[PDB]
Write a protein that binds this ligand. Structure first.
Ligand code: CLA
Ligand code: CLA
Ligand code: CLA
Ligand code: CLA
Ligand code: CLA
Ligand code: CLA
Ligand code: CLA
Ligand code: CLA
Ligand SMILES: CCCCCCCCCCCCCCCC(=O)OC[C@H](COP(=O)(O)OC[C@@H](O)CO)OC(=O)CCCCCCCCCCCCCCC
Ligand SMILES: CC1=C(C/C=C(\C)CCC[C@H](C)CCC[C@H](C)CCCC(C)C)C(=O)c2ccccc2C1=O
Ligand code: SF4
Lengths: 741, 167, 163
């Protein structure tokens, strides 16, 4: 039995003595503060476990228990959300009439006149309209009562307590040994077969037994009062057979193999439910059941204790070709001996997955009455896009950290990492060329269109009525997806999404989802997206590859991961560390995602979202002005920013006034960040010297000498405030533009 | 050399000490020393499955057809009867369920204790009223007859379940 | 092991806690302070003994002069929170509980205070001759009995009027 449980009992004593010795973790900070810089360092190195102990076992035990703490925090957050839904929300009124009632689960105390923020959402209720789509999620779960929300919150609180206790227990009482952590095969088997496999299976069971019948009754018009409790759907089979007359057969078809008998509630119709405007619940049930089967199957791939299984070490060592020397030899050691490598991969994947979620959820609204809630759709899309970008850049940063710290050339001789480091110059040069090519061509299309439109030469622009750049490949793919039902997906009644083509799904006179046509403006904006993504990849990849050494600093690794510079020599050596590459990559990621969000918002407002008449006529929010106005920079400035910013600037005196205040505050913080971004530390140090003289002249002099922020901290603060200001500005802009509806 | 099946050898782990042992272990599951089962779990599970199966057989017989305690009407085979009894007197059936649950929790603690030390034998709860443990022969005979007639209980209950579940 | 003879001999038990009989299947005491557990058990028992006495008292008897006391035990909590008597009893019990929280912390620190020691013997029913241990066994046992009995009474009265 190679895979076995190993723990140390009473690893760490539990006491408050350390709580009164801040900075105990690090050897340098444990000596007490001489200057204010110490303070900052104590908050910067708090979670840098690798720099606090030289033993991997101790770092692993800290990471495990910190993850337990994060789970406790997340469970507390879920408990709070559910409790505010049960006690402070109009969930029942929204249930009764989802179309008219505006979701809201937050109430403001009237203390300074802020009660104006209590909007007239409806349902004899006043509160702040929420855009987290929690009401749609709860309806998809067939909640239909506030007692269930209350008990959901209580369970979440108990789970948060359990997570906290588990963290404490697994640090101070039973801390697993290092050999326990270094089980990639067993961990993958357990996370795939159970965490993701049985999780899907259990959720599919819930949907089949709870969500499906309740939502079917709700769609039929049954008032939530008359819907029997979910447990009533588990005791009397006939009560469910009325809705899906396949339970009558029971589980015998499942074991007999006649799964076709379950097609009543396990369908593959796809498309969207015309009533609620969301995905069919039966489709999601079949989806989760299939995913559960696949995950359970995939969880048996790796060898843990019985001979059968895959050894990932051999798997990696086996893949090597003529062009790559030793192939994937040494990657298993890297990913089982350094948390930074694993964190880089996991953060990159989580970020990309979050962006994929954002793209898929809007195209195929998964919850009932979420499609027509334009405010929820936009908020969810932008939120998950931002999360994905942040996670991607974090993965880059931790890859760089691994390269600086946990990279060992002795164990990486002529493998993939060695070869990549050995043709990094070619990689970066070509990425630079492609970035310049993309930027030039894509952005110069916009500049050319703007110049021609300013000169009155409209026939010379890159527009539909002018030189045309049709995204022919995307249109061809859309056509194929349109034709898929019946030909390449014969058992699928309807296309996966109505974006590609088909009817106009509208719920309550609102266009839930309709086909999206791609024109020259779509071509140009997509190439802008590609340009920005390529530039961000350039910055971050350059930071990762040149993290250890460069033709400027052959010994950069000795300087550490984040350092300000290496002096004004060799010309200038500012921002030469990989941390500074992350610092710039964050700006470029923010820029790219801002463009992505603007594209999504304008395209959806001008081409998808709108209203329908009984005849079938379509009237979009902005009247389809995207095709002929999204092709010039002035068009974006006028028809998108200036035109759609009316709601924020005019929100004063209404329930949305908070959005205008936050708009101004975000502008203020964004401008404030420039103070740190542009200026340097010496000026501020001298100014502080003068101020310290002034204090001393009155015998006021802190023992902790004041110090200007370190160069690295100056950059970090500037970047943090820049991102906060930009994100908040767009947050207020979108929410006020999409809540005045 | 197994007495039950001469063509496949008897397991090393099975020495015949446990009752009802005829060396009938083809797959050699008694040899498990992983995931915490180790043939003491299997023995306990056998005794428990068999006891509850004997109770199940006696219950389904329903010869008196007075619903066990008075006030319980009507006679039905399995599922409708269970639901109907739960419907008419949820208080009593819940009480029985919780009695079983309490004995189950205490039993699980006891299983862990028996794993750690041999003080608790498999299938042993010290519930013997006769309190007969001085001489082995009678104890062994009673235990092995329990296991045999409970195995028959389980097979009979399968004979019950099979009816009405097929196509 | 006492009572349950097949359980694993409760650890850190006996030699204290007059009410103990050796029944610790889960054995929380092993990994938590026994003093804290004793305090919790004693306080739950006292509060619930008073709760049983109140519930039986409210049972069509001893109602206070105010008209609001025509209301029954089940509706008593609602009528009291509306009347505000419940908030006041909360106030006073909270004061007592904070003053006792100081004592609980001291007991845990090693102050030497016994679990339920509140020095409350106006009629000193206890005496060296009476035997404090004999007096406590009854206290703890009748407290556990009251805990379980009140749980049952409230539940099965929420089902149907016990009397
Ligand atoms: C209440 C019980 C208790 C006590 C007395 C201690 C005491 C101790 N722990 Mg333990 N620990 C506990 C609970 C406890 N811990 C729990 C529940 C967990 C699971 C998360 C851990 C996980 C843990 C780890 C992984 C480590 C310690 C360490 C330590 C030592 C230093 C901790 C310190 O001074 O930081 C005090 C810090 C704080 C008070 C800040 C905590 C911030 C919380 C968690 C988040 C709340 C803010 C959040 C962001 C919301 C606002 C927004 C000290 C012996 C360290 C040690 O001994 O190594 C040398 C160590 O590495 N503990
Ligand atoms: C986790 C997410 C979350 C969030 C963001 C909120 C946010 C909010 N809640 Mg909700 N709530 C949550 C979870 C959450 N709650 C949970 C889990 C519960 C169940 C218990 C509730 C139950 C609840 C109720 C019942 C009510 C709210 C209310 C409120 C609002 C006012 C809170 C406030 O300032 O009161 C004042 C809070 C304070 C002044 C905080 C106390 C200050 C402490 C003492 C500072 C101590 C810091 C300390 C020094 C740090 C070091 C640690 C030290 C202990 C050692 C606000 C919108 C109220 C509301 O909306 O009114 C209409 C309201 O009535 N919440
Ligand atoms: C973890 C998920 C989960 C859970 C806990 C349950 C639990 C249950 N199901 Mg469901 N079921 C599930 C997933 C799940 N199912 C899935 C994925 C499908 C699709 C194939 C079904 C399809 C299904 C049908 C068609 C029926 C049930 C029924 C039942 C009940 C009887 C169980 C039984 O006799 O099986 C015996 C136990 C084992 C084989 C073990 C029970 C409450 C029956 C019911 O509602 O009667 C009360 C019934 O007719 N289930
Ligand atoms: C076969 C049953 C089944 C059904 C009915 C659905 C139904 C759905 N899926 Mg799911 N899905 C399935 C299986 C299924 N899925 C599997 C097996 C995968 C793994 C790749 C996915 C991955 C997936 C993603 C990533 C997303 C969906 C989404 C959706 C929804 C989009 C609307 C639609 O018409 O979907 C039609 C669905 C399809 C056309 C996908 C079919 C995928 C096929 C079956 C792949 C099969 C792979 C094959 C088994 C590989 C085996 C290799 C192995 C042997 C080594 C819908 C509820 C979307 C959603 O809910 O967003 C809100 C979404 O973003 N599905
Ligand atoms: C799984 C997620 C994850 C984990 C576990 C870590 C863990 C770590 N990171 Mg990584 N990182 C992540 C995600 C993650 N990071 C992401 C997404 C990014 C991209 C931004 C980075 C970028 C990054 C860099 C560039 C660096 C690290 C560093 C570190 C280490 C020290 C962190 C520390 O001391 O915190 C200290 C935490 C703080 C000081 C709190 C500051 C939080 C921000 C600035 C403010 C948040 C504002 C709030 C959300 C909104 C405010 C509202 C306003 C109105 C008030 C530690 C190993 C550092 C290191 O050297 O490690 C070796 C380092 O240099 N990380
Ligand atoms: C809006 C202002 C602006 C502009 C135009 C640029 C432009 C550029 N940046 Mg910079 N950048 C900016 C703001 C800007 N950045 C800010 C605010 C930051 C702070 C975070 C950065 C940080 C930054 C980094 C860290 C990196 C860049 C990179 C790049 C290049 C991307 C490749 C490209 O598009 O080449 C094509 C050039 C353009 C599209 C510029 C417009 C040229 C037009 C189309 C034609 C002009 C007319 C023509 C020349 C007429 C000639 C005759 C005339 C002289 C009379 C490019 C030089 C990357 C780089 O250099 O590597 C590739 C890089 O790594 N930038
Ligand atoms: C980079 C973006 C971009 C693009 C694609 C264009 C494209 C165009 N512009 Mg515009 N323009 C731009 C930016 C751009 N412009 C900017 C930034 C400005 C502001 C300064 C203007 C201002 C402007 C004006 C004022 C006018 C134009 C005009 C034109 C047209 C004729 C230009 C010409 O004579 O071609 C010259 C082309 C060449 C010399 C060929 C060189 C390029 C070749 C194709 C590269 C091939 C490389 C090859 C693939 C390598 C293969 C290697 C292999 C052998 C191994 C053409 C449609 C004119 C017009 O009216 O259009 C109708 C006009 O009057 N432009
Ligand atoms: C000393 C405690 C005590 C006592 C004397 C009783 C006594 C009784 N209970 Mg109560 N009960 C108790 C604790 C207790 N229970 C506890 C701890 C619970 C769990 C909270 C319950 C939950 C309970 C329910 C749910 C019901 C009873 C019922 C009954 C009666 C059934 C008697 C019979 O022969 O059957 C009986 C008067 C039943 C009754 O008749 O009412 C009934 O329906 N009891
Ligand atoms: C997915 C990526 C698709 C494009 C991959 C290009 C062929 C890539 C390919 O076939 O590589 C295969 C080539 C062969 O390696 P081996 O087969 O010897 O390696 C065995 C592996 O198992 C690794 O050990 O690897 C390299 O030479 C890497 C450096 C590539 C130098 C060419 C890079 C060109 C990049 C730009 C191309 C962009 C095209 C459009 C992208 C959408
Ligand atoms: C303004 C500025 C300073 C001076 C700024 C200092 C010393 C920060 C002062 C912080 C005060 C004392 C804390 C209180 C601030 C707010 C009232 C609230 C707290 C905000 C967070 C710390 C939580 C630098 O030291 C510096 C260094 C390098 C590049 C740019 C700059 C730079 O721009
Ligand atoms: S300006 Fe600042 S970052 Fe640049 S070399 Fe001088 S000290 Fe270093």
């Amino acid at each position: 039995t190679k895979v076995k449980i190993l723990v140390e009992r009473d690893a760490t004593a539990t006491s408050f003595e350390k709580w009164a010795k801040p900075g105990h973790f690090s050897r340098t900070l444990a000596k007490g503060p001489k200057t204010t810089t110490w303070i900052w360092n104590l908050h910067a190195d708090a979670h840098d476990f690798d720099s606090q102990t030289n033993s991997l076992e101790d770092v692993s035990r800290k990471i495990f228990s910190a993850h337990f703490g994060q789970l406790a925090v997340i469970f507390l957050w879920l408990s709070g959300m559910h409790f505010h839904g049960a006690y402070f929300s109009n969930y029942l009124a929204w249930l009764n009439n989802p179309t008219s009632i505006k979701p809201s689960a937050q109430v403001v105390w009237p203390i300074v006149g802020q009660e104006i923020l209590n909007a007239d959402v409806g349902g004899n209720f006043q509160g702040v309209q929420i855009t987290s789509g929690f009401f749609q999620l709860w309806r998809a779960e067939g909640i239909t009562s506030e007692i269930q929300l209350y008990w959901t919150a209580i369970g979440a609180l108990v789970m948060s307590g359990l997570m906290l206790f588990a963290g404490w227990f697994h640090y101070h009482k039973a801390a697993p040994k290092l050999e326990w952590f270094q089980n990639a095969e067993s961990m993958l088997n357990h996370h795939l077969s159970i965490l993701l496999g049985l999780g899907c299976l259990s959720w599919a069971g819930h949907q089949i037994h709870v969500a499906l019948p309740i939502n079917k009754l709700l769609d039929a018009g049954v008032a939530p009062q008359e819907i029997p409790l979910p447990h009533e759907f588990l005791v009397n089979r006939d009560l469910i057979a009325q809705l899906y007359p396949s339970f009558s057969k029971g589980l015998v078809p499942f074991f007999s193999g006649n799964w076709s008998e379950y097609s009543d509630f396990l369908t593959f119709k796809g498309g969207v439910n015309p009533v609620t405007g969301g995905l069919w619940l039966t489709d999601t049930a079949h989806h989760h059941l299939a995913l559960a089967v696949l995950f359970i199957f995939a969880g048996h791939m790796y060898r843990t204790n019985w001979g059968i299984g895959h050894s990932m070490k051999e798997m990696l060592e086996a893949h090597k070709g003529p062009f790559t020397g030793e192939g994937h030899a040494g990657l298993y050691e890297i990913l089982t001996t350094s948390w930074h490598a694993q964190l880089a991969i996991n953060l990159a994947m989580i970020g990309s997955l979050s962006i994929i979620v954002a793209h898929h959820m809007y195209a195929m609204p998964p919850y009932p009455y979420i499609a027509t809630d334009y405010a929820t759709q936009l908020s969810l899309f932008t939120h998950h896009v931002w999360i994905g970008g942040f996670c991607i850049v974090g993965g880059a940063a931790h890859g760089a950290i691994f390269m600086v710290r946990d990279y060992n050339p002795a164990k990486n001789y002529n493998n993939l990492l060695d070869r990549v480091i050995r043709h990094r110059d070619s990689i970066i040069s070509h990425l630079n060329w492609v970035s310049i090519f993309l930027g030039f061509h894509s952005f110069g299309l916009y500049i050319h269109n703007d110049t021609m439109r300013a000169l009155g030469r409209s026939q010379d622009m890159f527009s539909d009525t002018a030189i045309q750049l049709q995204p022919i490949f995307a249109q061809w793919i859309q056509n194929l997806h349109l034709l898929a039902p019946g030909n390449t997906a014969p058992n699928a009644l309807t296309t996966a999404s109505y974006v590609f083509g088909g009817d106009v799904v509208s719920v309550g006179s609102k266009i839930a989802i309709m086909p999206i046509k791609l024109g020259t403006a779509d071509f140009m904006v997509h190439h802008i997206h590609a340009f920005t993504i390529h530039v961000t990849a350039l910055i971050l990849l350059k930071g990762v590859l040149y993290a250890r050494s460069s033709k400027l600093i052959p010994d950069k690794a000795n300087l550490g991961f984040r350092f300000p510079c290496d002096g004004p020599g060799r010309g200038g050596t500012c921002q030469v560390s990989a941390w500074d590459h992350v610092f710039l990559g964050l700006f470029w990621m923010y820029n790219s995602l801002s463009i992505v969000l603007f594209h999504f918002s304008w395209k959806m407002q001008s081409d998808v979202w709108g209203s329908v008449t009984p005849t079938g006529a379509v009237s979009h929010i902005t009247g389809g002005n995207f095709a002929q106005s999204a092709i010039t920079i002035n068009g974006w400035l006028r028809d998108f920013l200036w035109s759609q910013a009316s709601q924020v600037i005019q929100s004063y005196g209404s329930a949305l006034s908070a959005y205008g205040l936050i708009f101004l505050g975000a502008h203020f913080i964004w401008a404030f960040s420039l103070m740190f971004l542009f200026s340097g530390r010496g000026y501020w140090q001298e100014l502080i010297e003068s101020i310290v003289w002034a204090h001393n002249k009155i015998k006021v002099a802190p023992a902790i000498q004041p110090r200007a922020l370190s160069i690295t901290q100056g950059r970090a603060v500037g970047l943090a405030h820049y991102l906060l200001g930009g994100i908040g500005t767009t947050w207020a802009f979108f929410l006020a533009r999409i809540i005045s509806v | 050399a197994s007495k039950s099946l001469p063509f496949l050898p008897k397991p090393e782990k099975l020495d015949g000490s446990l009752p009802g042992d005829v060396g009938f272990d083809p797959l050699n599951l008694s040899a498990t020393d992983e995931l915490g089962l180790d043939l003491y779990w299997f023995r306990e599970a056998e005794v428990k499955h068999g006891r509850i199966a004997m109770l199940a057989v006696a219950g389904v017989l329903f010869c008196d057809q007075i619903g066990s305690l008075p006030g319980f009407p009507s006679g039905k085979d399995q599922m409708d009867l269970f639901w109907q009894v739960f419907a008419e007197k949820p208080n009593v059936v819940g009480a029985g369920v919780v009695a079983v649950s309490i004995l189950e929790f205490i039993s699980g603690i006891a299983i862990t204790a028996g794993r750690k030390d041999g003080s608790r034998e498999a299938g042993d709860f010290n519930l013997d009223p006769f309190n007969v443990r001085a001489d082995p022969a009678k104890k062994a005979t009673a235990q092995l007859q329990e296991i045999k007639n409970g195995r028959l209980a389980m097979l009979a209950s399968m004979g019950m379940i099979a009816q009405g579940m097929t196509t | 092991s006492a009572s349950i003879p097949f359980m694993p001999k409760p650890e850190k038990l006996d030699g204290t806690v007059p009410g103990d009989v050796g029944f610790d299947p889960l054995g929380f005491s092993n990994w938590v302070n026994l003093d804290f557990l004793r305090e919790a058990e004693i306080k739950h028992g006292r509060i619930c003994m008073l709760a049983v006495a109140g519930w039986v008292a409210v049972d069509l008897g001893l109602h206070l002069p105010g008209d609001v006391h025509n209301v029954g035990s089940l509706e008593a909590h609602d009528t009291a929170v509306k009347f505000g008597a419940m908030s006041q009893i909360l106030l006073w019990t909270s004061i007592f509980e904070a003053i006792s929280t100081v004592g609980v912390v001291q007991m845990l620190n090693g102050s030497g205070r016994q679990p339920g020691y509140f020095g409350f013997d106006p009629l000193n029913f206890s005496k060296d001759a009476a035997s404090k241990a004999k007096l406590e066994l009854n206290e703890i046992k009748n407290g556990r009995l009251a805990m379980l009995a009140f749980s049952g009474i409230v539940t099965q009265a929420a089902l149907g009027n016990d009397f």
